[PDB]
Ligand SMILES: *[C@H](O)[C@H](Cc1ccc[nH]c1=O)NC(=O)[C@H](CC(C)C)NC(=O)c1cc2c(OC)cccc2[nH]1
């Protein structure tokens with residue numbers, strides 16, 4: 099019993115973290131096979147950089163790459179969108195089975211926060227509809243990564259580049275393409291309007307039911323259309339039928355049809371919890387996907 | 402910027418997790434040097450076990466220990482309080498620098514939840530004043546461990562044995578001694594009355610200030626005595642001067658004396674947040690120690 103915001107075991111990713119220094123800037127890189135991936139702004143010195151030019155100047159030896167104590171000789175270098183790829187003379191023996199994936203807003207992943215090539219800690223978070231994440235990142239964390247694990251395969255989805263004036267965070271996929279409309283410039287860039295991930299809240303309510311919190315379960319039902327109208331008023335993402343279907347397995351487990359839970363959520367948005375808590379929380383939690391709930395409640399393990 | 406409930410990187414502990422089977426029961430063990438530590442109730446078959454007797458029957462070969470794919474030959478076995486120690490013929494090459502510690506209520510640690518010797522995920526939690534933890538543990542998780550990391554040293558403090566009727570969790574230190582008044586019997590054991598960790602709430606308020614949430618900061622001050630009276634009414638641990646001193650460094654950082662923050666908390670207990678949030682939360686968070694705050698806000702890393 100019990101429901102926690104659980105992160106993936108981090109060891110497979112820990113074994114890939116390195117430190118990358120160019121001139122005076124040091125940030126984190128990701129060492130897979132004989133390539134180190136890192137954010138390209140390590141070659142900055144930055145209000146508007148011309149990264150292709152800065153890279154003509156730079157030669158391999160200008161990149162100091164340290165894997166713990168060991169220095170790794172850079173024998174080649176290239177750029178792909180906003181990430182630098184440093185070919186090194188040594189393949190990482192701890193490289194896991196891996197993919198690069200681009201996630202969708204609403205999906206979750208674990209962040210391994212690193213400084214100077216060493217891990218500080220791990221937590222789970224959601225890609226917000228506005229393509230930001232509400233993380234815990236200080237200066238020097240750039241190049242920390244986000245990931246999911248599927249059995250033995252690490253799917254890297256996020257590399258950290260920037261903190262916005264709002265104090266939320268923004269970065270790229272491992273092909274260097276930013277999530278959302280940001281650029282890797284030392285300029286102030288505004289977020290974009292966020293909304294709550296409605297399908298995730300419903301998953302979290304099924305998790306509550308599975309654990310034992312049911313007070314919020316109202317006797318009524320509703321239509322997808324009617325619900326999506328009450329949602330718009332409270333800044334909630336529209337629920338699609340793809341979402342309704344993703345919730346089917348939880349619905350079948352708990353004996354509660356999706357539209358009934360939709361009724362029960364519709365109430366909460368209108369009356370609040372009146373001092374009550376769901377799974378130890380007093381706000382409606384939207385950073386658990388339906389998969390996350392099934393994983394945690396089923397004891398799914400990795401390898 | 403940003404404050405998350407961050408767990409320790411789990412890789413050092415991942416490298417120690419093994420599967421232990423006796424007859425039909427399989428749970429998790431901790432492999433350090435040539436010893437595997439696990440909960441002794443793996444030799445049960447359980448309403449009131451006589452563990453010393455069951456162990457006379459058992460011979461080494463009766464313990465099936467698997468480290469991933471590899472079987473580890475048990476060449477000796479012994480009990481220490483509620484944990485079994487299985488000497489194996491092979492020393493774990495991934496053993497980290499480590500200590501066994503017994504933590505104090507109010508302190509925090511990370512849990513690496515495992516099943517069948519494999520990790521499911523990692524999260525941070527607090528030892529409650531009543532010596533329980535509010536975890537996420539299913540049947541078969543027993544032998545999962547809790548730990549802290551200090552640079553390169555893993556300090557193991559918790560091994561999981563039981564879930565109480567309340568659905569909170571209870572276990573031992575790595576010397577097999579239970580936290581709180583529980584026993585490893587298949588019986589229903591009641592918790593004991595819990596309270597909120599007052600020093601941790603204050604740390605969490607300094608964390609808020611450090612990040613930018615200050616609305617709750619009242620202009621008044623108060624005495625330790627006066628505050629501890631308002632606390633008792635709301636089921637809050639008494640704040641001692643040892644606690645006040647542990648908060649000194651945060652106080653010095655933020656320019657806010659400890660007793661002033663005590664005034665500002667005294668209000669919240671009396672008026673609530675009136676629909677407002679501190680660090681994205683609408684309840685007063687008590688699972689961050691003062692150290693946890695400084696670690697996270699300072700970028701402290703491990704190795
Ligand atoms: C890389 O380690 C850091 C990450 C970081 C810095 C500070 C706080 N939290 C963090 O996570 N990245 C950067 O510093 C960016 C460097 C590159 C992409 C140019 N810069 C920013 O993230 C940044 C820059 C600015 C301004 O510059 C005018 C203005 C306002 C906000 C801002 N954020």
Ligand SMILES: *[C@H](O)[C@H](Cc1ccc[nH]c1=O)NC(=O)[C@H](CC(C)C)NC(=O)c1cc2c(OC)cccc2[nH]1
Nearest residue numbers: 442538539540541542543562563564585586587588589
């Ligand atoms: C070990 O893997 C499990 C852990 C566990 C089981 C179920 C749910 N969450 C969990 O974390 N431990 C056990 O099953 C204990 C076995 C040993 C210590 C005997 N048993 C319990 O934790 C337990 C036993 C009971 C009752 O037995 C009459 C009654 C009520 C609650 C209860 N908990």
